[model samples]
Target: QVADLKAFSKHIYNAYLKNFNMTKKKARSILTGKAAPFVIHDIETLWQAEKGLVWKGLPPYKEISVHVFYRCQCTTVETVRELTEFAKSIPSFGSLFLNDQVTLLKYGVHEAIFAMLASLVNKDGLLVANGSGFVTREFLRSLRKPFSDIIEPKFEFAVKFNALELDDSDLALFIAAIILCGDRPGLMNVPRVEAIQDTILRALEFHLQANHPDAQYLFPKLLQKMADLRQLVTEHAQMMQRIKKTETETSLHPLLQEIYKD
Candidate 1:
């Protein structure tokens, strides 16, 4: 069977015919706060979506839509891999995500976090995942004068910012993977995050099971990496928390200078 990417998107446009007669009111309603649950109701709903890149001068801040021309005729594996690769590329897409810019920010975030980083970069830089909004700003505030100091680092990398790239559904799946594994990347290190992501992918024996057990034995390879990650996050973080500041330090917590000094 022939599968076309545009075909999926065109189907959405076709739905806007006769009765639908696409209108701004309908568009807004469908893309608004109520959209997510609505989409879940009918995952196969054929609807048109016009990709309006916000940074490129779009109103939505960040959104991309498509019109489907075909129904469910694609392989799940192919679809998933395509999406996974896309998510991995999101962080490195924009110039703001560049290491130079990120390192200067010290908090080390990227354009993927513009909405949340906007305020923090201005006030300072860096925002922790709040479980609701990119960590908590308070925790980030506390680290202002000590990120470079008390820093043993759970791993070589940090927790990282997904920029909500994978959306709620995909993100939920990724979070599930984290739950099965773990999500503790210490400090601003990133190799650690990559390390964990690798473990999750490796633990998924299906990749090797596809051939045969012996065709690819990820057991030893997998065990070693997972164990390494667990060890680092558990013990390494505590060591870094011991970072000390010189008594004459003028920048050791400006807000609490008098408190920490005396």
Candidate 2:
């Protein structure tokens, strides 16, 4: 049984590495300036450059802010695709009803996305433009109203989450746990999902013991982080709704709109 669990862990870890566009290791290298092709540290310079281009044809701050969110949504949609493939790679996930699969992805994708966002984030900023550009926290905060409000909370979560020091392998099990959560609304077969989640959690516990032998309580700490992730997604959805109501000129991606639709 233990050997079977070990194999399962390795399988998911391989899937994570193959699927994720940017891993924490790569993000760290970019953040440290080891692998960055171009840095977008200065908000004013970026604004001026944008103003000279098509942005000049558009409005001022609103367009820039909307553009930033559009880039964010594009990345998020890409991650959702990667996540769907990653979930399919899990052997047991294919056994579920197709509707259950869609339900799970709909509810769980944002949680997984934000959890993975920790990889692209550090104290000062996060990697944007596929690790080529590092956008500062302050710059995101400089955006107007709801757009600015949306980013800082994620940065705070990412900074605290980074302190957990989990590598990609650890994150594989963690993200799987987030998606397979039994308590998700509209789960057709609760016990089935619960049993699967239990197995993943067990594998995670065993993996953590071997991988972080000196780190006491890491498993429980991670469970708490999962709860934190849920809250973050809730807050994010609320902010998105606010944007929908107030930021009439700003448009949300259709996929994102579906995800946040209550």
Candidate 3:
């Protein structure tokens, strides 16, 4: 099982690359400086911006509409589901005690999601809701306070995060490490989880050296990004709570809602 971990992670990452695309194309293409996924990134006029940014005239003017917000939540829900399944596929992950699995998913899924979200960010903006459109940084700022604030930091983190230029192979092990982390407050098997996390980290470091021979400090930088993701998810949960209170029609998928309950 240990010997197969690198391959297992790469397979999971490939599935992630396939499933997480807003456009259902290879997400790594964007990270490698390929052209945009047939979506406009920046628009000046509100009319054009609304048409370009939101699907089906669910305008993100002043506030994002319920239908649009629901779509975004659904995207997150589906990504989390896919990632959860992927984690279970790894022998080391599958071998965890069942309660430990739930605990890891509860605390770690959002962080894993945000780390993957970095792939969809460029210096200009982020791809919205699986490539239905692009939401400009400026336009995101124009929205209501807390809602606008939610995404900006990810884009900011993503900008510098993308500067490191990690490919899918490197990202797979990193994400695996993020999910299997032993530091969450309620973990049942901290020692075993820590051992597992350490194994994943070693695998990631060794893989990085071969995959990115010339990049110094890349491994350390990614560790910091994991810390950064934990912070981003905390803010995300706070924003999600505010939305649940104020945005009546924006129903979260039950699975997505459960993650924030803790």
What is the C-alpha local distance difference test score of each model?
A: 0.27, 0.83, 0.70
Candidate 3 or 2, higher lDDT: 2
Off by over 4 Å in 1: 1-178, 181-203, 211-215, 244-262
Comparing 2 with 3 on TM-score, the higher-scoring candidate is 2
Error of 1 at 94 (Å): 33
Tens digit of lDDT per residue, candidate 1, span 70-170? 11111112222333333333222222234422232222111111222222221222221111112222332333333422221321222222221212222
lDDT of 2 by residue, 106-184 (tens): 9999999999988989877777646766677777888777778898898899989999899999999999999998888
Error of 3 at 253 (Å): 2.5
- Pick out the ten consecutive residues of candidate 1 with the lowest summed lDDT: 64-73
lDDT of 1 at 23: 29
- Residue 98 miss distance in model 2 (angstroms): 0.7
